[PDB]
Amino acid sequence: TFGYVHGVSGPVVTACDMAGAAMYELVRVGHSELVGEIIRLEGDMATIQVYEETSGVSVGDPVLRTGKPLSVELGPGIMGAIFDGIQRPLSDISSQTQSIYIPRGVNVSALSRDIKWEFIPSKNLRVGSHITGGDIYGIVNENSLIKHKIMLPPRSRGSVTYIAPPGNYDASDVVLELEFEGVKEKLSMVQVWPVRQVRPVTEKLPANHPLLTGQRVLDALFPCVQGGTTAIPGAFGCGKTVISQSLSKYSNSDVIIYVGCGERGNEMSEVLRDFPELTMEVDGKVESIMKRTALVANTSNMPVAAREASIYTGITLSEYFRDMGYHVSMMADSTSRWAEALREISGRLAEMPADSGYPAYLGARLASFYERAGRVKCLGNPEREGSVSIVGAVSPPGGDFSDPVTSATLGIVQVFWGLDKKLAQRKHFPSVNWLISYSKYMRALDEYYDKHFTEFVPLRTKAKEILQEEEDLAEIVQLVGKASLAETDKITLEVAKLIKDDFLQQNGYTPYDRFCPFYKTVGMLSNMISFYDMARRAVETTAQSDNKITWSIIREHMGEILYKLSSMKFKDPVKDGEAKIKADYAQLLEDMQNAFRSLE
Amino acid sequence: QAAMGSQGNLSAEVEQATRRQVQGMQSSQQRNRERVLTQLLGMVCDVRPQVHPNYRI
Amino acid sequence: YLSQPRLTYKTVSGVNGPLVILDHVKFPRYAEIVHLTLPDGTKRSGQVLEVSGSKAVVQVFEGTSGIDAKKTSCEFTGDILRTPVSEDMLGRVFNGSGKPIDRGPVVLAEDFLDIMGQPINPQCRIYPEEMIQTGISAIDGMNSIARGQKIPIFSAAGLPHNEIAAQICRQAGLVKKENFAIVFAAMGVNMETARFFKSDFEENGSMDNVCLFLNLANDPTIERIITPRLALTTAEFLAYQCEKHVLVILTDMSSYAEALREVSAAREEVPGRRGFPGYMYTDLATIYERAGRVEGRNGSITQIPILTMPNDDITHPIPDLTGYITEGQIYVDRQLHNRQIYPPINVLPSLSRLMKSAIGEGMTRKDHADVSNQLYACYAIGKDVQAMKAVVGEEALTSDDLLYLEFLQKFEKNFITQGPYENRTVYETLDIGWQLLRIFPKEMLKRIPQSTLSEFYPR
Ligand SMILES: Nc1ncnc2c1ncn2[C@@H]1O[C@H](COP(=O)(O)OP(=O)(O)O)[C@@H](O)[C@H]1O
Ligand SMILES: [Mg+2]
């Protein structure tokens, strides 16, 4: 049942006497029992990808062959917890080893077996009942936010022979006993699923509901949807991590799985410190955010091979909660660090590289990762509906969107949130380019917007036309010097500035811009567009008369309106609620109309 | 001139403080030297033969 | 401990570049250190970068010139490069191999630590929430330094990045209105640079709290990629075992990257950009991420990994991959230096990721964040106006544009220009900020809410 180490080249270990080993089986390499996964088979020798540092591993060290593939434990005890790249809890390691460093070769259960969970059965099953994969036969109260559904694993079925009455049970007990054909299966609350296999669904459905983001841009102009996939290929300093944190903090998702794959160590500590201090009311009660989030840490200075396991563990966790009827919006803040791991391993493997040193199958890995997103009808008789969204960062070198990872990613994801380093240098955050970005879900959400708002869509269109027209003018204005501009064009240029400075950018570290409720975004946009139309009309109706209302006349006459419009961001939605904000915006519209009547 | 004399005698204090520390160090280790020799010599005399953990058969 | 005698081999199979390949080795261990003696008595060391069966590939630190095939004698230590560390390393000067060069004795270890180190458990890592007062307005105001932050200075050949680092070493304090142990890795530099820092540390009267590691331009290029780890390993001992606050400065990190690139080429590893290894990022993270505070212990490590940007190319892999790992950068340039501005720090392309937590009520002054953001807006716009005026002429500008040129001109001489020994407080820096911001009318200060302008703007 053992092999022996033949050689070590770093993250790749070669072992012998493993004739019966299959690809993508787990192994334990070394006397510390380091976790690895078999990549290649050459005769009776196996090539092992090891997720822990191989320093100190000797030729001749035993290799334990484990039949089970890389897998994740799924059950109660996930929410609020932080895991490493292979599903080992960091709070349990630190509480058991008393160290500040993560030891190598730690064999710790993913989900604690000491906690006595409060379990209630569905009350609809009886002995002799027929249960199928995905069925829920009880719920565990992890906390007040997420109700943890105990599902029958996929590829399992049979007749019920015993169901645990309501009471206190731990993860080592038996909750459900079922039999199929003589063979009997005893299940606890924890199921095991290979992280490289896609959990099966009844039907993949179109995404027809917004994924609310606490941002003005990245929502009004480039919507994301529940179940959709997007990329943020920002250069260093562009603030893509802050966008990811903002989406996690303030969104309409039920569960967030945050994967720090190659991320700075300070970022995961930042989350653990800040998140417990955030609030999200449930039913009149104030609750912490961490009860509905979970996160995986595989930091930049951790084993590079573990970056692949981290990504697959994250999405597998996301699917698990998707199956329970929750909307999941996971985000892996790197992607490039995963592809980088693939390159380093491919090098050690002496494989023939493709574009820029990356493996030829880079696109294959990204395609199969992102396609696990989507709104689905779940397996299981209870007819759940869920989703997994994926918001993945990319780190193109130099900010040049030409590398194989950015290029392949853009061919897969349906929403492109491109960031511009030259906007970040100006602290124009979020640094969204708004010229190269796009969202392919605009048509999907048009029905939603008409149902709840109506006014939003024509405002979105006019805003894009103004910003695009300003860019078309900026190209020539740089050369002309604003000498040949018509008065109708100067209005576009200055209103476009108004939009850029007050609407597209917001300071996510303030009490007023940390979250931007949609009604506020469309409210203040309506005012900005209403100004555009009234100001453009004012000159269009007077240019041929005996006095033309040039920009300098409206600018001096309505300077107070331009200041009020710029102040619309400083509304503090937590202190001043919807009623005051809408009434305030209505007053600005009246002030504009009255000033225009006195002008024209 | 005042500064040079101060530096001179400041150096004398440095030299005098150093001699104090060196003699104190010698006085301390003289109380443990014999115990350390016994512990170290035992570890040398205790051979402890062993076969490499990875030797097969 | 390791009681078994170590084995000595004369079984060298062959030599290929910097790599000496041995055969007939008993149970080779990966990443173990080998000591070898040349036929002429020269002693050298190297590390096993690959094992396979009875073979092992040793990368020799000093070099492979003079390595024989029949008379070369090698012995395997049986462990990884664990290095002796002690508290009294402060005040000592070492070479890039960890040996003393100050005519003192070898290190009398309190323990032996793995030079590769271990990753700090992110659950016990505590997010930095204290600010360091560098005394430089260009930093303390608009790009604050936190204790536990990683902030390199991006520089270019010929710029005074050595003077800025030296200045920071002496006038780095706290804004709580403190003696930092400095570990300085001088690698890939000439004698005059190393002597400059060594002399400055003595001139500052702080040498008893400074540990130096020197690896000069005329020293082996392979030792240049362990010197940072030697510095950081000592820093980790001091910070996390003895609760001493440590400031670690790594000199031109580009000499690290170039030394690594040479190793990457020698080992035929997969290149990424500009010939650097595809794993350059991972290797840099091993160096950079050895920083920050740890919950339950009163120490910290702050890093300033200054680096030279080849050809002032901010997208060069060295500053690029560093920019992805560290919490921003200070960035100096030639446009300021060529005008005799010191320190020549250009705030526009700079940032501090931990700065947002560091500023404000309970840390410095409540208007800190507002002053910084508006100064960035006004400075960047002034630069945009210069780009315009260079073509259209001064006559094409209006009063809204001239104000930004007035700000830009006054900003660089009042805010950035200081001098090697000008030590300003963070509060004085903000006061200066307001003096410059008050150039504009309230309506143009669009990054600051009226709830702040009404209190501070009138003065
Ligand atoms: N949306 C934002 N709102 C406010 N400040 C931001 C925003 N995005 C970025 N920043 C600022 O700029 C810094 C850079 O963002 P960060 O996410 O660290 O960059 P990266 O793109 O490298 O992940 C942040 O630490 C913060 O100070
Ligand atoms: Mg980031």
mmCIF file of N, CA, C and O in Angstrom, chain A residues 6-8 10 56-59 90 94 100-102 235-237 262 264-266 269 273 300-301 307 337 340 343-344 347-348 396 398 425-427 507 509 555, chain C residues 27-30 50-53 118-119 121 123-127 150 240 269-270 278-279 281-282 285 289 320 324-327 348 350 353 356 373 384 400 447:
data_model
loop_
_atom_site.group_PDB
_atom_site.id
_atom_site.type_symbol
_atom_site.label_atom_id
_atom_site.label_comp_id
_atom_site.label_asym_id
_atom_site.label_seq_id
_atom_site.Cartn_x
_atom_site.Cartn_y
_atom_site.Cartn_z
ATOM 1 N N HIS A 6 11.403 8.534 -5.296
ATOM 2 C CA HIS A 6 12.557 8.364 -6.167
ATOM 3 C C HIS A 6 13.355 9.636 -6.387
ATOM 4 O O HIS A 6 14.584 9.553 -6.483
ATOM 5 N N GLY A 7 12.728 10.803 -6.456
ATOM 6 C CA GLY A 7 13.444 12.041 -6.687
ATOM 7 C C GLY A 7 12.565 13.236 -6.398
ATOM 8 O O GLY A 7 11.342 13.103 -6.331
ATOM 9 N N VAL A 8 13.170 14.409 -6.226
ATOM 10 C CA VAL A 8 12.440 15.631 -5.895
ATOM 11 C C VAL A 8 13.022 16.776 -6.723
ATOM 12 O O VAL A 8 14.237 16.984 -6.773
ATOM 13 N N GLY A 10 11.413 19.944 -6.440
ATOM 14 C CA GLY A 10 10.674 21.066 -5.911
ATOM 15 C C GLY A 10 9.260 20.681 -5.545
ATOM 16 O O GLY A 10 9.026 19.807 -4.705
ATOM 17 N N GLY A 56 13.577 18.835 2.806
ATOM 18 C CA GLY A 56 13.805 17.782 3.774
ATOM 19 C C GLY A 56 13.320 16.419 3.340
ATOM 20 O O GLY A 56 13.610 15.428 4.027
ATOM 21 N N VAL A 57 12.591 16.316 2.235
ATOM 22 C CA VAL A 57 12.128 15.025 1.738
ATOM 23 C C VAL A 57 13.308 14.279 1.137
ATOM 24 O O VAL A 57 14.086 14.845 0.361
ATOM 25 N N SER A 58 13.452 13.010 1.498
ATOM 26 C CA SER A 58 14.589 12.203 1.089
ATOM 27 C C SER A 58 14.148 11.141 0.093
ATOM 28 O O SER A 58 12.992 10.712 0.093
ATOM 29 N N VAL A 59 15.077 10.729 -0.768
ATOM 30 C CA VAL A 59 14.844 9.550 -1.587
ATOM 31 C C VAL A 59 14.718 8.331 -0.689
ATOM 32 O O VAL A 59 15.495 8.143 0.251
ATOM 33 N N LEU A 90 -7.711 26.933 9.788
ATOM 34 C CA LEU A 90 -6.581 27.613 10.411
ATOM 35 C C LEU A 90 -6.851 27.909 11.880
ATOM 36 O O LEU A 90 -5.915 28.009 12.682
ATOM 37 N N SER A 94 -4.200 26.677 14.804
ATOM 38 C CA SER A 94 -3.649 27.607 15.784
ATOM 39 C C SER A 94 -4.108 27.280 17.198
ATOM 40 O O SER A 94 -3.386 27.560 18.159
ATOM 41 N N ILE A 100 2.432 29.997 15.674
ATOM 42 C CA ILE A 100 1.995 31.028 14.744
ATOM 43 C C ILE A 100 2.290 30.664 13.303
ATOM 44 O O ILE A 100 1.784 31.330 12.394
ATOM 45 N N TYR A 101 3.097 29.642 13.065
ATOM 46 C CA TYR A 101 3.349 29.142 11.727
ATOM 47 C C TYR A 101 2.513 27.896 11.487
ATOM 48 O O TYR A 101 2.198 27.152 12.417
ATOM 49 N N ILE A 102 2.145 27.679 10.230
ATOM 50 C CA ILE A 102 1.400 26.479 9.867
ATOM 51 C C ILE A 102 2.407 25.351 9.719
ATOM 52 O O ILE A 102 3.263 25.404 8.824
ATOM 53 N N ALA A 235 -4.315 46.016 -13.123
ATOM 54 C CA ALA A 235 -2.919 46.123 -12.729
ATOM 55 C C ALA A 235 -2.822 46.449 -11.240
ATOM 56 O O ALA A 235 -3.770 46.932 -10.617
ATOM 57 N N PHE A 236 -1.617 46.235 -10.697
ATOM 58 C CA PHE A 236 -1.329 46.513 -9.267
ATOM 59 C C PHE A 236 -1.698 47.955 -8.927
ATOM 60 O O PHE A 236 -1.264 48.872 -9.642
ATOM 61 N N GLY A 237 -2.491 48.134 -7.869
ATOM 62 C CA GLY A 237 -2.875 49.487 -7.434
ATOM 63 C C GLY A 237 -4.199 49.917 -8.034
ATOM 64 O O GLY A 237 -4.692 50.991 -7.650
ATOM 65 N N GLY A 262 -2.900 33.066 -3.794
ATOM 66 C CA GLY A 262 -1.726 33.860 -4.092
ATOM 67 C C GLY A 262 -1.800 35.286 -3.594
ATOM 68 O O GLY A 262 -1.090 36.162 -4.102
ATOM 69 N N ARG A 264 -1.807 38.616 -0.919
ATOM 70 C CA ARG A 264 -0.978 39.062 0.230
ATOM 71 C C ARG A 264 -1.603 38.560 1.534
ATOM 72 O O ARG A 264 -2.842 38.578 1.643
ATOM 73 N N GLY A 265 -0.770 38.150 2.491
ATOM 74 C CA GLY A 265 -1.265 37.609 3.771
ATOM 75 C C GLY A 265 -2.073 38.642 4.529
ATOM 76 O O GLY A 265 -3.033 38.250 5.217
ATOM 77 N N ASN A 266 -1.708 39.915 4.401
ATOM 78 C CA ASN A 266 -2.399 40.992 5.150
ATOM 79 C C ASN A 266 -3.861 41.062 4.708
ATOM 80 O O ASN A 266 -4.662 41.546 5.503
ATOM 81 N N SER A 269 -6.097 38.664 6.778
ATOM 82 C CA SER A 269 -6.199 39.202 8.160
ATOM 83 C C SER A 269 -7.154 40.391 8.165
ATOM 84 O O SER A 269 -7.973 40.482 9.092
ATOM 85 N N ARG A 273 -10.432 40.673 10.587
ATOM 86 C CA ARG A 273 -10.618 41.778 11.514
ATOM 87 C C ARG A 273 -11.863 42.594 11.209
ATOM 88 O O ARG A 273 -12.668 42.842 12.112
ATOM 89 N N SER A 300 0.435 34.257 -1.002
ATOM 90 C CA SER A 300 1.453 34.254 -2.043
ATOM 91 C C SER A 300 2.701 33.490 -1.619
ATOM 92 O O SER A 300 3.399 32.933 -2.472
ATOM 93 N N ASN A 301 3.004 33.455 -0.320
ATOM 94 C CA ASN A 301 4.261 32.867 0.132
ATOM 95 C C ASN A 301 4.060 31.439 0.615
ATOM 96 O O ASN A 301 4.944 30.849 1.244
ATOM 97 N N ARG A 307 -2.105 26.415 -4.881
ATOM 98 C CA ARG A 307 -2.944 27.409 -5.534
ATOM 99 C C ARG A 307 -3.999 26.773 -6.422
ATOM 100 O O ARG A 307 -5.094 27.327 -6.567
ATOM 101 N N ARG A 337 -2.416 33.897 -10.511
ATOM 102 C CA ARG A 337 -1.581 33.146 -9.594
ATOM 103 C C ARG A 337 -1.836 31.653 -9.713
ATOM 104 O O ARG A 337 -0.911 30.858 -9.522
ATOM 105 N N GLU A 340 -0.203 30.798 -12.929
ATOM 106 C CA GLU A 340 1.227 30.813 -12.646
ATOM 107 C C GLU A 340 1.675 29.504 -12.012
ATOM 108 O O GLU A 340 2.731 28.971 -12.361
ATOM 109 N N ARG A 343 2.056 26.967 -14.641
ATOM 110 C CA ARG A 343 3.275 27.153 -15.420
ATOM 111 C C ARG A 343 4.482 26.579 -14.694
ATOM 112 O O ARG A 343 5.305 25.879 -15.291
ATOM 113 N N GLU A 344 4.601 26.866 -13.400
ATOM 114 C CA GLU A 344 5.743 26.378 -12.638
ATOM 115 C C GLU A 344 5.757 24.857 -12.585
ATOM 116 O O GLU A 344 6.817 24.236 -12.736
ATOM 117 N N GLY A 347 6.685 23.473 -16.016
ATOM 118 C CA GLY A 347 8.125 23.546 -16.176
ATOM 119 C C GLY A 347 8.847 22.392 -15.517
ATOM 120 O O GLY A 347 9.675 21.726 -16.139
ATOM 121 N N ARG A 348 8.536 22.145 -14.244
ATOM 122 C CA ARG A 348 9.212 21.045 -13.510
ATOM 123 C C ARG A 348 8.907 19.733 -14.233
ATOM 124 O O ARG A 348 9.785 18.854 -14.251
ATOM 125 N N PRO A 396 -2.606 40.880 -15.030
ATOM 126 C CA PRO A 396 -1.743 40.970 -16.202
ATOM 127 C C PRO A 396 -0.475 41.742 -15.887
ATOM 128 O O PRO A 396 -0.527 42.802 -15.246
ATOM 129 N N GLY A 398 2.312 44.364 -16.141
ATOM 130 C CA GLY A 398 2.388 45.675 -16.745
ATOM 131 C C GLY A 398 1.059 46.324 -17.043
ATOM 132 O O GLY A 398 1.041 47.446 -17.560
ATOM 133 N N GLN A 425 -3.961 55.961 -10.690
ATOM 134 C CA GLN A 425 -2.949 56.929 -10.291
ATOM 135 C C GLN A 425 -3.581 58.246 -9.869
ATOM 136 O O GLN A 425 -3.057 58.932 -8.987
ATOM 137 N N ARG A 426 -4.710 58.603 -10.464
ATOM 138 C CA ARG A 426 -5.480 59.791 -10.122
ATOM 139 C C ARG A 426 -6.459 59.543 -8.989
ATOM 140 O O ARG A 426 -7.249 60.432 -8.651
ATOM 141 N N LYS A 427 -6.406 58.359 -8.386
ATOM 142 C CA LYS A 427 -7.275 57.989 -7.276
ATOM 143 C C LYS A 427 -8.740 58.121 -7.681
ATOM 144 O O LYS A 427 -9.606 58.526 -6.905
ATOM 145 N N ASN A 507 -15.603 56.823 -2.916
ATOM 146 C CA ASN A 507 -14.572 56.451 -1.955
ATOM 147 C C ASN A 507 -15.128 55.380 -1.031
ATOM 148 O O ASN A 507 -15.936 55.672 -0.145
ATOM 149 N N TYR A 509 -14.135 53.902 1.393
ATOM 150 C CA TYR A 509 -13.686 53.964 2.804
ATOM 151 C C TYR A 509 -14.269 55.225 3.447
ATOM 152 O O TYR A 509 -13.517 55.985 4.084
ATOM 153 N N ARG A 555 -23.120 78.424 -16.875
ATOM 154 C CA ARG A 555 -22.201 78.061 -15.803
ATOM 155 C C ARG A 555 -22.239 79.087 -14.677
ATOM 156 O O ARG A 555 -22.286 78.723 -13.497
ATOM 157 N N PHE C 27 20.673 7.895 0.002
ATOM 158 C CA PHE C 27 19.418 8.548 0.352
ATOM 159 C C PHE C 27 19.545 10.063 0.279
ATOM 160 O O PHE C 27 19.485 10.743 1.311
ATOM 161 N N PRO C 28 19.719 10.630 -0.910
ATOM 162 C CA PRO C 28 19.810 12.085 -1.026
ATOM 163 C C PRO C 28 18.592 12.780 -0.444
ATOM 164 O O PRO C 28 17.454 12.328 -0.583
ATOM 165 N N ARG C 29 18.847 13.906 0.212
ATOM 166 C CA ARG C 29 17.795 14.735 0.770
ATOM 167 C C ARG C 29 17.657 16.005 -0.057
ATOM 168 O O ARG C 29 18.651 16.628 -0.434
ATOM 169 N N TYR C 30 16.419 16.385 -0.340
ATOM 170 C CA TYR C 30 16.170 17.590 -1.117
ATOM 171 C C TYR C 30 16.428 18.833 -0.284
ATOM 172 O O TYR C 30 16.009 18.923 0.872
ATOM 173 N N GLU C 50 18.045 19.271 -6.645
ATOM 174 C CA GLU C 50 17.350 18.118 -7.273
ATOM 175 C C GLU C 50 17.983 16.823 -6.769
ATOM 176 O O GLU C 50 19.216 16.773 -6.640
ATOM 177 N N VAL C 51 17.150 15.821 -6.506
ATOM 178 C CA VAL C 51 17.583 14.469 -6.197
ATOM 179 C C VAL C 51 16.809 13.498 -7.074
ATOM 180 O O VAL C 51 15.636 13.704 -7.387
ATOM 181 N N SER C 52 17.495 12.436 -7.485
ATOM 182 C CA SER C 52 16.889 11.374 -8.278
ATOM 183 C C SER C 52 17.677 10.094 -8.071
ATOM 184 O O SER C 52 18.824 9.998 -8.515
ATOM 185 N N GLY C 53 17.084 9.103 -7.416
ATOM 186 C CA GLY C 53 17.802 7.869 -7.186
ATOM 187 C C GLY C 53 19.064 8.111 -6.387
ATOM 188 O O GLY C 53 19.014 8.631 -5.271
ATOM 189 N N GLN C 118 8.929 29.763 7.443
ATOM 190 C CA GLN C 118 7.616 29.152 7.374
ATOM 191 C C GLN C 118 6.596 30.257 7.166
ATOM 192 O O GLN C 118 6.784 31.379 7.648
ATOM 193 N N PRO C 119 5.515 29.980 6.449
ATOM 194 C CA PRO C 119 4.454 30.977 6.320
ATOM 195 C C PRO C 119 3.729 31.174 7.639
ATOM 196 O O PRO C 119 3.458 30.228 8.380
ATOM 197 N N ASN C 121 0.616 31.782 9.875
ATOM 198 C CA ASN C 121 -0.786 31.392 9.816
ATOM 199 C C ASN C 121 -1.655 32.632 9.658
ATOM 200 O O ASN C 121 -1.737 33.454 10.577
ATOM 201 N N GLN C 123 -4.576 33.206 10.123
ATOM 202 C CA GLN C 123 -5.597 33.413 11.140
ATOM 203 C C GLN C 123 -5.015 34.096 12.369
ATOM 204 O O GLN C 123 -5.742 34.768 13.106
ATOM 205 N N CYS C 124 -3.712 33.947 12.597
ATOM 206 C CA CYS C 124 -3.055 34.590 13.729
ATOM 207 C C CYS C 124 -2.355 35.880 13.328
ATOM 208 O O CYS C 124 -1.985 36.676 14.196
ATOM 209 N N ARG C 125 -2.147 36.094 12.034
ATOM 210 C CA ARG C 125 -1.649 37.376 11.550
ATOM 211 C C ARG C 125 -2.626 38.483 11.896
ATOM 212 O O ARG C 125 -3.829 38.351 11.662
ATOM 213 N N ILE C 126 -2.123 39.565 12.475
ATOM 214 C CA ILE C 126 -2.972 40.646 12.924
ATOM 215 C C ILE C 126 -2.788 41.832 11.988
ATOM 216 O O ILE C 126 -1.684 42.152 11.556
ATOM 217 N N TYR C 127 -3.905 42.401 11.538
ATOM 218 C CA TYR C 127 -3.822 43.466 10.509
ATOM 219 C C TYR C 127 -3.220 44.692 11.183
ATOM 220 O O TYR C 127 -3.714 45.075 12.258
ATOM 221 N N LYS C 150 4.755 46.554 4.039
ATOM 222 C CA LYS C 150 5.839 46.376 3.084
ATOM 223 C C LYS C 150 5.814 47.487 2.038
ATOM 224 O O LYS C 150 4.972 47.485 1.137
ATOM 225 N N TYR C 240 9.667 38.011 16.436
ATOM 226 C CA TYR C 240 8.625 37.083 16.855
ATOM 227 C C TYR C 240 9.028 36.203 18.021
ATOM 228 O O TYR C 240 8.160 35.555 18.612
ATOM 229 N N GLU C 269 15.004 26.761 -16.579
ATOM 230 C CA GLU C 269 13.591 26.896 -16.132
ATOM 231 C C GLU C 269 12.790 27.751 -17.122
ATOM 232 O O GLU C 269 13.395 28.555 -17.854
ATOM 233 N N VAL C 270 11.467 27.572 -17.107
ATOM 234 C CA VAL C 270 10.504 28.252 -17.974
ATOM 235 C C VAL C 270 10.545 29.757 -17.728
ATOM 236 O O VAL C 270 10.279 30.216 -16.612
ATOM 237 N N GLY C 278 9.480 31.954 -14.495
ATOM 238 C CA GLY C 278 8.039 32.004 -14.385
ATOM 239 C C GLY C 278 7.559 31.938 -12.953
ATOM 240 O O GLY C 278 6.405 32.267 -12.660
ATOM 241 N N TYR C 279 8.439 31.520 -12.049
ATOM 242 C CA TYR C 279 8.126 31.471 -10.629
ATOM 243 C C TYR C 279 8.717 32.644 -9.857
ATOM 244 O O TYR C 279 8.758 32.604 -8.624
ATOM 245 N N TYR C 281 7.552 35.479 -9.163
ATOM 246 C CA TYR C 281 6.586 35.994 -8.201
ATOM 247 C C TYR C 281 6.598 35.172 -6.922
ATOM 248 O O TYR C 281 6.711 35.719 -5.821
ATOM 249 N N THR C 282 6.503 33.848 -7.046
ATOM 250 C CA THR C 282 6.499 33.002 -5.859
ATOM 251 C C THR C 282 7.772 33.186 -5.047
ATOM 252 O O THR C 282 7.725 33.263 -3.816
ATOM 253 N N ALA C 285 7.598 36.470 -3.178
ATOM 254 C CA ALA C 285 6.692 36.378 -2.043
ATOM 255 C C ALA C 285 7.370 35.735 -0.845
ATOM 256 O O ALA C 285 7.142 36.151 0.294
ATOM 257 N N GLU C 289 6.901 38.534 2.019
ATOM 258 C CA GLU C 289 5.807 38.307 2.948
ATOM 259 C C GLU C 289 6.278 37.994 4.358
ATOM 260 O O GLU C 289 5.449 37.749 5.239
ATOM 261 N N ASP C 320 7.160 45.353 -11.338
ATOM 262 C CA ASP C 320 5.801 44.889 -11.589
ATOM 263 C C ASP C 320 5.391 43.830 -10.575
ATOM 264 O O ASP C 320 4.397 43.983 -9.857
ATOM 265 N N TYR C 324 2.768 43.935 -7.171
ATOM 266 C CA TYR C 324 1.666 43.023 -6.901
ATOM 267 C C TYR C 324 1.743 42.426 -5.505
ATOM 268 O O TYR C 324 0.727 41.972 -4.972
ATOM 269 N N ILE C 325 2.933 42.409 -4.902
ATOM 270 C CA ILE C 325 3.091 41.716 -3.630
ATOM 271 C C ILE C 325 3.074 42.689 -2.460
ATOM 272 O O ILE C 325 2.407 42.436 -1.451
ATOM 273 N N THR C 326 3.799 43.804 -2.597
ATOM 274 C CA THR C 326 3.961 44.791 -1.493
ATOM 275 C C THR C 326 2.742 45.711 -1.397
ATOM 276 O O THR C 326 1.966 45.765 -2.366
ATOM 277 N N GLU C 327 2.600 46.423 -0.274
ATOM 278 C CA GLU C 327 1.413 47.292 -0.051
ATOM 279 C C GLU C 327 1.626 48.656 -0.706
ATOM 280 O O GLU C 327 1.490 49.672 0.000
ATOM 281 N N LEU C 348 2.304 60.841 -7.500
ATOM 282 C CA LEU C 348 1.187 60.473 -8.363
ATOM 283 C C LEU C 348 1.135 58.964 -8.605
ATOM 284 O O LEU C 348 0.070 58.364 -8.415
ATOM 285 N N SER C 350 2.212 56.568 -6.890
ATOM 286 C CA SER C 350 2.497 55.880 -5.641
ATOM 287 C C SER C 350 1.188 55.568 -4.938
ATOM 288 O O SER C 350 0.173 56.223 -5.197
ATOM 289 N N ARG C 353 -1.269 50.680 0.595
ATOM 290 C CA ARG C 353 -2.499 49.866 0.755
ATOM 291 C C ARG C 353 -2.993 49.954 2.201
ATOM 292 O O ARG C 353 -4.219 49.993 2.395
ATOM 293 N N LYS C 356 -5.120 53.611 4.402
ATOM 294 C CA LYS C 356 -6.516 53.982 4.761
ATOM 295 C C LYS C 356 -6.779 53.652 6.231
ATOM 296 O O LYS C 356 -7.382 54.496 6.917
ATOM 297 N N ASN C 373 -6.537 62.859 -0.397
ATOM 298 C CA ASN C 373 -7.233 62.572 -1.646
ATOM 299 C C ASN C 373 -7.351 63.818 -2.514
ATOM 300 O O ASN C 373 -7.199 63.746 -3.739
ATOM 301 N N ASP C 384 -1.903 67.257 -15.795
ATOM 302 C CA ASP C 384 -2.683 67.221 -17.030
ATOM 303 C C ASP C 384 -2.682 68.584 -17.715
ATOM 304 O O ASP C 384 -2.642 68.675 -18.948
ATOM 305 N N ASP C 400 -9.401 78.583 -14.244
ATOM 306 C CA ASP C 400 -9.542 77.240 -13.700
ATOM 307 C C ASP C 400 -8.309 76.371 -13.924
ATOM 308 O O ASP C 400 -8.074 75.450 -13.139
ATOM 309 N N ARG C 447 -13.198 66.487 -3.665
ATOM 310 C CA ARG C 447 -12.966 65.227 -2.968
ATOM 311 C C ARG C 447 -13.223 65.350 -1.470
ATOM 312 O O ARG C 447 -13.173 64.346 -0.752
#
